[PDB]
Design a protein around this ligand. Structure first.
Ligand SMILES: [Mg+2]
Length: 209
């Protein structure tokens, strides 16, 4: 009857991988970038500064190496089954990520998602420039996007569900009707209505609808 909306974070939630850490491996700086990613997700760094710092380390990386990394990204256990059941229960399904469109768009197309929002790696002459731009950078960014999607769809915020795992999902939780922390960092678990620790997205279904 009443339309419903579910938003998923991308890295480590809808997919197994951390996009930026996989690209960093191709640039020879996996260790270094992984450390910053962990600190950012734990809430110990400002997200935007942490993302720009990581992307700066990727300066000059060829697009072919970026694509090699992205091709390794795989959906989390239970992703397809969960998305299918959500659509059957009447949900609009969206993904919001502080990651990158070049990676997120592939999964949007593969999984048939209704909406996908992510940042953008800047490229020139077939190589990363070391810069990033986008609308999923500020602390309140994901929550603002949740509100925008719900408004387009005419969905009351009480009929929204957010599934997240890192510090940058806090604003998404703030605006959501039901807050699910999926194998998440402490800072987000403290804000959650439900904390799931089994790494299988199907585990959220019992709490849905
Ligand atoms: Mg994440």
């Amino acid at each position: 009857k009443k339309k419903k909306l579910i938003l998923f974070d991308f890295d480590s939630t809808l997919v197994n991988n951390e996009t930026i850490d996989e690209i960093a491996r191709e640039a020879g700086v996996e260790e270094e970038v992984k450390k910053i990613t962990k600190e950012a997700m734990e809430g110990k760094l400002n997200f935007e500064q942490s993302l720009r710092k990581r992307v700066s380390l990727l300066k000059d990386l060829p697009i072919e190496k970026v694509e090699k990394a992205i091709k390794r990204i795989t959906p989390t256990e239970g992703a397809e089954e969960t998305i299918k059941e959500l659509k059957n229960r009447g949900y609009v399904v969206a993904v919001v990520s502080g990651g990158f469109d070049i990676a997120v768009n592939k999964i949007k197309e593969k999984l048939g998602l209704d909406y996908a929002f992510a940042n953008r790696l800047i490229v020139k002459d077939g190589k990363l420039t070391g810069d990033v731009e986008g609308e999923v950078l500020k602390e309140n960014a994901k929550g603002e996007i949740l509100e925008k999607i719900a408004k387009i769809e005419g969905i009351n915020l009480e009929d929204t569900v957010a599934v997240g795992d890192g510090a940058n999902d806090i604003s998404m939780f703030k605006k959501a009707g039901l807050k699910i922390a999926f194998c998440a960092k402490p800072i987000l678990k403290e804000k959650a209505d439900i904390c799931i620790e089994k790494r299988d997205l199907r585990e959220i279904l019992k709490y849905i609808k």
